[PDB]
Amino acid sequence: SLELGIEFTTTEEIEVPEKLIDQVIGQEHAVEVIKTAANQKRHVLLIGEPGTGKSMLGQAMAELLPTETLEDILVFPNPEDENMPRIKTVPACQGRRIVEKYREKLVPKLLVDNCGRTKAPFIDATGAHAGALLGDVRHDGLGTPAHERVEPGMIHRAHKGVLFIDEIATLSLKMQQSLLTAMQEKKFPITGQSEMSSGAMVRTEPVPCDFVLVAAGNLDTVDKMHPALRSRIRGYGYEVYMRTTMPDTIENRRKLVQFVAQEVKRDGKIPHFTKEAVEEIVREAQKRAGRKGHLTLRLRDLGGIVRAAGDIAVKKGKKYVEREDVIEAVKMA
Amino acid sequence: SLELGIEFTTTEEIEVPEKLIDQVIGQEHAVEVIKTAANQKRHVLLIGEPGTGKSMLGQAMAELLPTETLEDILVFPNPEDENMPRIKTVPACQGRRIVEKYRLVPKLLVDNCGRTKAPFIDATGAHAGALLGDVRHGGLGTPAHERVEPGMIHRAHKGVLFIDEIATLSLKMQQSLLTAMQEKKFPITGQSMVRTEPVPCDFVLVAAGNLDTVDKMHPALRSRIRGYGYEVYMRTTMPDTIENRRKLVQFVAQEVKRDGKIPHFTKEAVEEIVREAQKRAGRKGHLTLRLRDLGGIVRAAGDIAVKKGKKYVEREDVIEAVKMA
């Protein structure tokens, strides 16, 4: 049946782009905004239905950011003031070295270590509670020096990379507020997030957190999320309204062919697909479009079908996934 | 008394950038969006309070667009079918050559010969016929192709179409705009039946509106902008810092130059413009970015200075302009 607009026996023949940004399928405007935003270092709110590739675009952005100047972040003891540990940032890999120098001679703690990175960090903070997001102070014989007890926030791990938070409206109003402050200042002090503990008394100097925020949410997020945060993104960043379907044309069929090829590669443990199995993934993309004459761009789900059919094929000892494998994978719910 | 972050005696000594996008004051994010949009050719909706320089950003965008490739648009008779006049485009200046070489003559519908920048077409307030195209209604009578008139949309072909208060256009005109944006061509037909073949209209739309009015615009137009282009939520104030005062000094210099018939301002007169900008801000520690009002004060003080025969505008001229209307 299906015309796919390229001639191939299996997806083994299909060339997959090296960089994540070039693998994004059917979101050309989001893609060109991500590149702009990576180039300018601007925050982004990605708005789209679930399963639409939001975390992938965030990862794709992190690969675009510069890696020349990544830093390590250390915390030192403060002799003048125990409960205000001092922070220092150095070029990546100089962290471990400073610890060594001092471990050879109170040694400072390496809070965030970016040694050897070939891409800027991508820090997924979806679901994070206050301590995990913003940093925390562990509650500890002589007892423990304050500075050893300092734990970095996701905001600090994301220093000079990307901080991705999906379902951003689900975060508490107070965490959306502290995130704003982190964005405004590009630094944020670490303190104990449990108010009654030994950690509430510790408050470090401000810790660098120059992240690009890639926030995301479904179509109801614009209304529900904290309005100050929405204003900051509209004011200085990019809201990206992501597509949910594309039109069923030959050029777009072709991109699903690439999609299949990319999913096999990313999985690494399933076989390539025969042309007829690919046609069946298209058949499914037609059906899930919730339109007529359109293809779905809810590709997470379609991704699950690719991977499930692959797994079936492997259980049968096959060299390639076949149409029967996809059909079985779909019936499997 | 105010500190300005620069030493000068009059705005005569103030450098003004050659390109319009560089003259824009205090809208750094709008500015980087307009550059991006001009580079990728994407439509833009500017959302800001009245007198916030929306039109100027439209104009700056037109300067950023390619001029190498501009085209003329001719309309021709259709022998097969009089009431579907035929449309041809040719590289700019060829238009006039083709009419001369025919001199039933083709009509030059849009002439861009000579252009130093891509056209900036301001269709704010325009009616269906003017925006979309029209045709005029012992005599032999005029050939149809000669009665065809271009819309603003066709005039903006390979340029910028600017529409302030886009939300006050009728829904049917917004829808026609949308169709035009989708197809990059639009037939000219009489709005009150001649119907030409599709007429090129590959414009970049710069739509503008106010925060509390824009939600009324046609939702399919807005979705197309949100889907394929850029929404910009313009600032309305900037913080009162030295670095921002300095930009107001540049503002005065630019406005003097643009007006062309008023004198340059003394430092003290420029301090008074800054005071006005503090008071028009609404928030303490801020400066207004409602620069159209502030611009009216600069030009009205200059006009007062001229009536007094002065070489430069002084602080008293600014105070009088501000008390005056």
XYZ file of C-alpha atoms in Angstrom:
658
model
C 0.000 0.000 0.000
C 1.872 3.083 1.351
C 3.969 5.479 -0.659
C 6.816 6.613 1.670
C 8.702 8.786 -0.787
C 12.045 7.027 -0.591
C 13.081 3.570 -1.782
C 14.720 1.212 0.696
C 14.639 -2.383 1.821
C 15.317 -1.663 5.558
C 15.977 1.371 7.748
C 19.605 0.309 7.867
C 19.967 2.290 4.628
C 18.620 5.512 6.216
C 21.136 8.191 7.245
C 20.511 9.679 10.668
C 21.753 13.238 11.425
C 24.550 13.409 14.008
C 23.167 16.245 16.262
C 19.931 16.059 18.244
C 18.699 19.363 16.805
C 18.842 17.879 13.302
C 16.860 14.799 14.506
C 13.876 16.700 15.637
C 11.043 15.813 13.328
C 8.264 18.113 12.146
C 8.811 21.071 14.488
C 10.723 23.427 12.133
C 9.693 26.567 13.948
C 10.571 25.211 17.434
C 13.840 24.093 15.947
C 14.705 27.485 14.539
C 13.707 29.151 17.913
C 15.910 26.759 19.863
C 18.875 27.608 17.793
C 18.228 31.338 18.145
C 17.736 30.951 21.840
C 20.919 28.879 22.213
C 22.819 31.466 20.275
C 21.439 34.376 22.306
C 21.269 32.392 25.657
C 17.590 33.026 26.238
C 15.038 31.141 28.212
C 12.233 29.139 26.530
C 8.772 27.906 27.399
C 7.821 24.916 25.341
C 4.099 24.420 25.113
C 2.782 21.239 23.604
C 0.745 18.118 24.213
C 2.372 15.258 26.097
C 4.600 12.984 24.075
C 5.543 15.765 21.689
C 9.342 15.841 22.147
C 9.857 18.561 24.706
C 12.711 17.085 26.649
C 14.448 16.232 23.413
C 14.430 19.860 22.239
C 15.898 20.836 25.618
C 18.647 18.268 25.154
C 19.124 19.537 21.631
C 19.629 23.063 22.993
C 22.188 21.953 25.512
C 24.316 20.533 22.620
C 24.219 23.880 20.942
C 25.527 25.848 23.839
C 29.215 26.698 23.998
C 31.503 24.252 25.848
C 34.665 26.526 25.801
C 34.050 27.986 29.220
C 32.345 25.353 31.391
C 33.232 25.773 35.094
C 33.549 23.666 38.189
C 32.003 25.044 41.392
C 33.658 24.630 44.789
C 32.583 25.486 48.287
C 35.200 26.475 50.891
C 35.080 26.948 54.656
C 34.600 30.533 55.831
C 36.862 31.114 58.916
C 35.318 34.512 59.676
C 31.818 32.961 59.355
C 31.233 29.162 59.623
C 27.567 29.302 58.513
C 28.363 31.338 55.355
C 30.577 28.951 53.389
C 32.465 30.611 50.542
C 32.020 29.592 46.886
C 34.547 29.692 44.063
C 34.247 28.794 40.408
C 37.124 27.752 38.223
C 37.570 26.345 34.707
C 36.289 22.788 34.317
C 38.830 20.180 35.508
C 40.544 22.766 37.777
C 38.107 21.590 40.456
C 39.533 18.092 41.049
C 43.009 19.657 40.961
C 42.320 22.168 43.670
C 40.813 19.440 45.821
C 44.038 17.439 45.268
C 46.326 20.281 46.156
C 44.393 20.694 49.396
C 44.009 16.919 49.905
C 47.806 16.731 49.733
C 48.201 19.408 52.416
C 39.935 21.533 55.908
C 39.626 20.658 52.183
C 37.049 22.389 49.987
C 34.199 20.374 48.463
C 33.709 20.083 44.694
C 29.985 20.900 44.425
C 29.665 20.665 40.640
C 32.201 18.885 38.484
C 32.154 19.388 34.764
C 35.598 17.897 33.960
C 35.827 16.221 30.541
C 32.480 17.463 29.273
C 32.077 17.661 25.516
C 28.652 19.248 25.829
C 27.107 21.689 28.261
C 25.090 20.051 30.926
C 21.440 19.157 30.470
C 19.861 18.992 33.912
C 16.333 17.556 34.096
C 14.614 18.928 37.166
C 11.066 17.839 36.470
C 9.373 16.942 39.724
C 12.178 18.300 41.886
C 11.258 19.492 45.404
C 12.847 22.643 46.915
C 16.053 21.107 48.222
C 16.780 19.265 44.973
C 16.009 22.353 42.872
C 17.537 25.137 44.848
C 20.122 23.370 46.985
C 20.117 22.133 50.512
C 22.171 21.700 53.704
C 22.495 18.162 55.072
C 21.912 17.782 58.836
C 24.936 16.040 60.369
C 32.401 13.130 67.751
C 33.400 16.593 66.384
C 30.437 17.118 63.979
C 30.702 18.270 60.362
C 32.128 21.564 58.943
C 29.300 23.565 57.351
C 30.854 23.674 53.897
C 31.061 19.848 53.569
C 27.329 19.733 54.198
C 26.308 22.018 51.290
C 24.459 20.156 48.462
C 24.030 21.780 44.994
C 20.663 22.527 43.460
C 19.697 21.424 40.038
C 19.967 25.181 39.255
C 23.680 25.050 40.087
C 24.376 21.788 38.138
C 22.878 23.660 35.213
C 25.386 26.509 35.468
C 26.377 27.280 31.799
C 24.021 24.607 30.503
C 20.312 23.923 30.342
C 17.823 23.455 33.131
C 14.782 21.557 31.859
C 11.558 21.494 33.890
C 8.560 19.775 32.355
C 5.110 20.380 33.910
C 6.457 23.625 35.213
C 2.942 24.673 36.398
C 3.060 21.815 38.882
C 5.893 23.410 40.830
C 4.793 25.367 43.871
C 4.329 29.091 43.544
C 7.309 29.592 45.912
C 9.658 27.426 43.849
C 8.667 29.301 40.634
C 9.460 32.459 42.520
C 12.895 31.316 43.676
C 13.630 30.158 40.106
C 12.809 33.666 38.906
C 15.242 35.067 41.346
C 17.867 32.631 40.126
C 17.204 33.753 36.551
C 17.453 37.481 37.430
C 20.593 37.112 39.462
C 22.396 34.190 37.694
C 23.411 33.118 41.263
C 21.519 31.747 44.207
C 22.669 30.989 47.754
C 22.410 27.535 49.094
C 20.581 27.148 52.384
C 18.768 24.486 54.353
C 15.288 24.042 52.941
C 13.903 22.370 56.043
C 13.331 25.406 58.349
C 13.651 23.663 61.736
C 16.933 21.820 61.107
C 20.672 22.555 61.631
C 20.803 23.431 57.919
C 18.521 26.497 58.031
C 21.366 28.267 59.897
C 23.789 27.714 56.966
C 23.657 30.079 53.993
C 26.419 30.045 51.523
C 27.569 32.935 49.405
C 25.626 33.181 46.148
C 26.353 30.110 43.969
C 26.493 30.570 40.196
C 23.485 29.331 38.194
C 23.654 30.898 34.746
C 21.358 28.305 33.157
C 19.123 28.619 30.200
C 15.730 27.496 31.389
C 13.770 25.284 29.113
C 10.425 25.111 30.816
C 7.655 23.011 29.388
C 4.065 22.193 29.782
C 0.828 21.148 28.155
C -1.603 23.703 26.683
C -3.074 24.477 30.148
C 0.380 25.549 31.585
C 0.231 29.128 30.205
C -2.906 29.776 32.286
C -1.814 27.865 35.462
C 1.864 28.562 35.909
C 3.101 31.435 38.015
C 2.425 34.694 36.132
C 5.671 36.419 37.058
C 7.554 33.476 35.512
C 5.369 33.596 32.382
C 6.134 37.396 32.206
C 9.848 36.915 32.460
C 9.831 34.376 29.629
C 7.574 36.552 27.395
C 9.670 39.598 28.222
C 13.109 38.261 27.678
C 12.724 34.716 26.193
C 10.648 32.645 23.719
C 7.286 30.979 24.200
C 7.187 28.064 21.701
C 3.704 26.715 20.696
C 4.513 23.287 19.399
C 2.596 21.484 16.634
C 0.536 18.359 17.350
C 0.090 17.061 13.807
C 1.591 17.579 10.443
C -0.051 17.136 7.066
C 0.134 13.704 5.545
C 2.299 14.388 2.522
C 5.141 12.443 0.946
C 7.719 14.857 2.378
C 6.316 14.273 5.885
C 6.132 10.465 5.358
C 9.745 10.641 4.536
C 10.430 12.308 7.935
C 8.652 9.379 9.722
C 11.059 7.097 7.847
C 13.880 9.057 9.414
C 12.068 8.892 12.758
C 12.029 5.060 12.673
C 15.646 4.940 11.765
C 16.519 7.328 14.613
C 14.578 5.337 17.185
C 16.248 2.089 16.279
C 19.655 3.773 16.605
C 18.823 5.428 19.866
C 17.529 2.127 21.256
C 20.599 0.183 20.109
C 19.126 -3.285 20.946
C 16.436 -3.765 18.282
C 16.666 -4.606 14.658
C 16.129 -2.243 11.766
C 12.770 -2.148 10.164
C 11.653 -3.479 6.801
C 9.979 -0.974 4.488
C 6.625 -2.636 5.135
C 7.008 -2.286 8.905
C 7.750 1.445 8.368
C 4.594 1.711 6.330
C 2.778 0.279 9.298
C 4.313 2.891 11.648
C 2.955 5.532 9.187
C -0.404 3.791 9.235
C -0.330 4.199 12.996
C 0.805 7.835 12.703
C -2.213 8.466 10.432
C -4.523 6.898 12.960
C -3.171 8.665 16.029
C -3.311 12.101 14.253
C -6.890 12.562 15.529
C -7.448 14.194 12.123
C -7.916 12.931 8.558
C -5.170 13.612 6.052
C -2.675 14.207 8.910
C 0.183 12.486 10.725
C 0.740 12.518 14.509
C 3.551 14.429 16.024
C 2.925 12.752 19.392
C 6.034 10.783 18.721
C 6.789 9.503 22.235
C 3.904 7.072 21.903
C 4.877 6.167 18.343
C 8.415 5.769 19.715
C 7.059 3.193 22.206
C 5.513 1.243 19.334
C 8.793 1.251 17.382
C 10.662 -0.054 20.420
C 7.975 -2.625 21.355
C 7.906 -4.047 17.820
C 11.670 -4.221 17.895
C 11.492 -6.161 21.175
C 9.000 -8.606 19.600
C 11.238 -9.102 16.650
C 14.180 -9.902 18.933
C 12.102 -12.442 20.919
C 11.544 -14.158 17.523
C 15.133 -14.104 16.562
C 14.569 -11.880 13.526
C 17.133 -9.991 11.446
C 14.551 -7.219 10.915
C 11.303 -5.990 12.304
C 8.444 -6.852 10.037
C 4.998 -5.659 9.557
C 3.556 -8.449 11.714
C 5.786 -7.284 14.595
C 4.312 -3.723 14.571
C 0.750 -4.919 14.374
C 1.483 -7.226 17.292
C 3.091 -4.309 19.182
C -0.006 -2.185 18.658
C -2.492 -4.832 19.829
C -0.188 -5.018 22.979
C -1.599 -1.754 24.420
C 21.252 68.602 38.191
C 20.608 65.074 36.825
C 23.553 62.883 36.036
C 23.415 61.646 32.352
C 26.408 59.327 31.917
C 27.934 61.507 29.242
C 29.509 64.978 28.937
C 28.254 67.201 26.194
C 27.215 70.760 25.674
C 24.446 70.102 23.128
C 22.972 67.142 21.392
C 24.880 68.331 18.292
C 27.763 66.321 19.779
C 25.721 63.098 19.973
C 26.438 60.284 17.500
C 23.407 58.614 15.956
C 23.594 55.099 14.521
C 23.228 54.710 10.704
C 20.663 51.830 10.859
C 17.201 52.100 12.292
C 17.362 48.864 14.342
C 20.363 50.416 16.122
C 18.328 53.511 16.953
C 15.673 51.637 18.783
C 15.807 52.506 22.520
C 15.481 49.982 25.328
C 13.674 47.070 23.760
C 16.644 44.679 23.582
C 14.526 41.555 23.263
C 12.236 43.070 20.546
C 15.357 44.139 18.749
C 17.031 40.704 18.735
C 13.590 39.140 17.668
C 13.211 41.607 14.755
C 16.749 40.685 13.553
C 16.019 37.039 13.788
C 12.705 37.372 12.051
C 14.188 39.375 9.258
C 16.915 36.770 8.800
C 14.488 33.820 8.701
C 11.569 35.835 7.100
C 9.036 35.286 9.845
C 5.953 37.232 10.830
C 5.887 39.107 14.065
C 3.240 40.288 16.392
C 4.276 43.254 18.541
C 2.317 43.659 21.660
C 2.817 46.905 23.473
C 1.184 50.039 24.799
C 0.398 52.889 22.424
C 3.391 55.166 21.598
C 5.981 52.461 22.263
C 7.602 52.516 18.786
C 5.949 49.617 17.150
C 6.010 51.173 13.689
C 9.639 52.055 13.936
C 10.499 48.355 14.647
C 8.503 47.483 11.497
C 10.579 49.970 9.554
C 13.833 48.732 10.973
C 12.869 45.298 9.896
C 12.241 46.430 6.317
C 15.897 47.806 6.274
C 17.171 44.464 7.327
C 15.547 42.567 4.492
C 17.254 41.703 1.213
C 16.923 44.226 -1.630
C 18.937 42.214 -4.280
C 15.896 40.359 -5.333
C 13.018 42.850 -5.364
C 10.376 42.445 -8.122
C 7.922 44.559 -10.155
C 4.409 43.272 -10.740
C 2.664 43.773 -14.110
C -0.890 42.946 -15.018
C -1.694 41.788 -18.608
C -4.926 41.171 -20.586
C -6.258 37.578 -20.708
C -7.424 36.838 -24.343
C -8.749 33.419 -23.265
C -10.641 35.308 -20.496
C -10.909 39.129 -20.122
C -12.152 38.908 -16.467
C -9.122 36.884 -15.306
C -6.325 39.316 -16.138
C -2.877 37.637 -16.145
C -0.074 38.564 -13.632
C 3.647 38.650 -14.281
C 6.561 39.489 -11.991
C 9.990 40.560 -13.189
C 13.226 41.809 -11.522
C 12.801 45.393 -10.396
C 13.249 48.068 -13.148
C 12.401 45.518 -15.858
C 8.785 46.511 -15.187
C 9.080 49.902 -16.814
C 11.186 48.447 -19.674
C 8.415 45.980 -20.572
C 5.786 48.761 -20.588
C 8.037 50.945 -22.812
C 8.694 48.021 -25.196
C 4.861 47.699 -25.524
C 4.559 51.425 -26.059
C -2.948 46.277 -25.435
C -0.246 47.500 -23.067
C 0.555 45.721 -19.770
C -0.018 47.791 -16.632
C 2.750 48.261 -14.012
C 0.941 47.279 -10.846
C 3.820 47.599 -8.411
C 7.054 49.423 -9.245
C 10.092 48.861 -7.049
C 12.730 50.215 -9.506
C 15.396 52.292 -7.748
C 14.683 50.930 -4.289
C 17.413 51.242 -1.713
C 15.420 49.183 0.852
C 12.699 46.606 0.848
C 9.337 48.273 1.007
C 7.645 49.162 4.252
C 3.936 49.307 3.707
C 1.819 50.636 6.465
C -1.715 49.251 6.125
C -2.898 50.362 9.510
C -6.606 51.263 9.269
C -6.887 50.110 5.610
C -10.171 48.867 4.127
C -10.660 45.631 2.210
C -9.980 47.064 -1.254
C -6.851 49.007 -0.290
C -5.456 46.066 1.757
C -6.395 43.134 -0.546
C -6.743 44.788 -3.956
C -9.620 46.184 -5.916
C -10.777 46.952 -9.427
C -12.455 50.215 -10.541
C -16.058 50.085 -11.931
C -20.806 56.504 -26.563
C -18.166 54.572 -24.671
C -16.066 51.492 -25.504
C -15.070 51.110 -21.793
C -11.731 50.281 -20.092
C -10.017 46.846 -20.436
C -10.309 44.880 -17.175
C -6.561 44.526 -16.531
C -6.239 48.288 -16.590
C -8.813 48.677 -13.841
C -6.913 46.333 -11.432
C -5.462 48.049 -8.317
C -2.885 46.464 -5.998
C -3.474 45.823 -2.416
C -1.097 46.868 0.321
C -0.410 43.151 0.584
C 0.985 43.166 -3.011
C 2.909 46.388 -2.537
C 4.620 44.689 0.442
C 5.735 41.787 -1.791
C 9.319 40.978 -0.641
C 8.992 43.600 2.082
C 7.172 44.370 5.272
C 3.500 44.795 5.804
C 2.841 46.673 9.065
C -0.664 46.708 10.666
C -1.179 48.413 13.977
C -4.477 47.608 15.817
C -4.651 44.488 13.762
C -7.455 43.410 16.103
C -9.762 46.126 14.790
C -9.763 44.730 11.217
C -12.817 42.701 10.373
C -12.518 38.949 10.881
C -12.989 38.366 7.123
C -10.004 40.705 6.380
C -7.871 38.898 8.995
C -8.842 35.644 7.402
C -7.892 36.999 3.963
C -4.519 38.127 5.384
C -4.050 34.627 6.793
C -4.830 33.088 3.411
C -2.406 35.478 1.814
C 0.283 34.520 4.343
C -0.334 30.791 3.685
C -0.289 31.039 -0.065
C 2.193 33.951 -0.561
C -0.137 34.996 -3.380
C -3.668 36.433 -3.466
C -5.999 37.197 -6.396
C -7.156 40.702 -6.936
C -10.907 40.980 -7.357
C -13.449 43.815 -7.112
C -14.501 44.425 -3.518
C -17.792 46.195 -4.500
C -16.714 40.114 -11.306
C -13.113 40.749 -12.295
C -10.720 38.293 -10.590
C -7.073 38.229 -11.593
C -4.911 35.243 -11.182
C -3.038 35.042 -7.861
C -0.851 38.109 -7.201
C 2.454 37.674 -5.353
C 2.361 38.970 -1.799
C 5.277 37.366 0.043
C 5.403 39.952 2.761
C 6.690 39.687 6.312
C 3.833 40.678 8.518
C 4.487 42.952 11.393
C 1.250 43.133 13.303
C 0.882 45.238 16.368
C -1.567 45.672 19.153
C -2.040 46.510 22.806
C -1.945 44.049 25.629
C -5.592 44.415 26.560
C -6.953 44.468 22.999
C -5.035 41.764 21.081
C -6.928 38.747 22.396
C -9.808 39.941 20.182
C -7.928 39.339 16.961
C -8.784 36.367 14.718
C -7.606 33.202 16.499
C -6.443 31.483 13.388
C -4.203 34.554 12.645
C -2.757 34.499 16.087
C -2.116 30.733 15.890
C -0.323 31.170 12.676
C 1.895 33.866 14.197
C 2.462 31.685 17.322
C 3.022 28.654 15.156
C 5.346 29.959 12.517
C 6.491 33.390 13.788
C 7.226 35.553 16.847
C 5.205 37.229 19.501
C 6.995 40.104 21.301
C 5.731 41.473 24.630
C 7.339 44.861 24.585
C 8.594 46.629 27.695
C 6.895 49.693 28.902
C 9.581 50.947 31.310
C 13.248 50.531 31.897
C 15.043 51.036 35.158
C 16.366 54.444 35.943
C 20.118 53.844 35.704
C 22.930 55.862 34.195
C 23.268 53.435 31.312
C 19.539 54.008 30.520
C 19.807 57.798 30.909
C 22.461 57.684 28.313
C 20.021 56.003 25.895
C 17.579 58.928 26.461
C 20.361 61.312 25.459
C 20.619 59.372 22.242
C 16.801 59.484 21.956
C 16.794 63.280 22.007
C 19.526 63.463 19.376
C 17.672 61.049 17.110
C 14.391 62.859 17.401
C 15.996 66.200 16.647
C 17.504 64.690 13.529
C 14.367 62.994 12.446
C 12.293 66.112 12.842
C 14.832 68.119 10.853
C 13.497 71.599 11.635
C 14.207 72.074 15.329
C 17.400 72.923 17.109
C 19.658 70.658 19.092
C 19.154 70.518 22.847
C 21.362 71.850 25.610
C 22.488 69.367 28.256
C 20.095 71.082 30.653
C 17.180 70.673 28.234
C 18.055 66.937 27.924
C 17.992 66.654 31.767
C 14.517 67.980 31.704
C 13.526 65.338 29.070
C 14.868 62.713 31.517
C 12.806 64.175 34.345
C 9.741 63.845 32.138
C 10.701 60.273 31.412
C 10.905 59.631 35.220
C 7.528 61.170 35.795
C 5.817 59.438 32.853
C 7.111 56.020 33.982
C 4.458 55.362 36.619
C 6.885 53.372 38.766
C 9.520 55.044 40.964
C 13.090 54.415 39.918
C 11.981 53.926 36.282
C 11.987 55.678 32.954
C 9.182 55.506 30.416
C 9.432 53.686 27.144
C 6.329 55.414 25.904
C 8.691 57.297 23.625
C 6.088 58.610 21.238
C 4.757 60.950 23.954
C 8.307 61.850 24.953
C 9.085 62.455 21.297
C 6.078 64.898 21.067
C 7.691 66.844 23.997
C 11.083 66.979 22.316
C 9.530 68.300 19.026
C 7.153 70.730 20.761
C 10.085 72.167 22.796
C 12.102 72.516 19.706
C 9.117 74.329 18.041
C 8.956 76.722 21.037
C 12.734 77.386 20.695
C 12.274 78.251 17.082
C 9.579 80.767 17.862
C 12.134 82.475 20.159
C 14.806 82.367 17.522
C 17.151 80.333 19.696
C 20.245 78.463 18.539
C 19.478 75.652 20.997
C 16.544 74.333 22.934
C 16.858 75.108 26.674
C 15.269 73.805 29.770
C 12.594 76.545 29.763
C 11.478 75.481 26.314
C 10.908 71.931 27.579
C 8.922 73.097 30.671
C 6.732 75.288 28.468
C 6.165 72.444 26.015
C 5.115 70.208 28.860
C 2.693 72.659 30.464
C 1.287 73.492 26.940
C -0.936 70.642 25.395
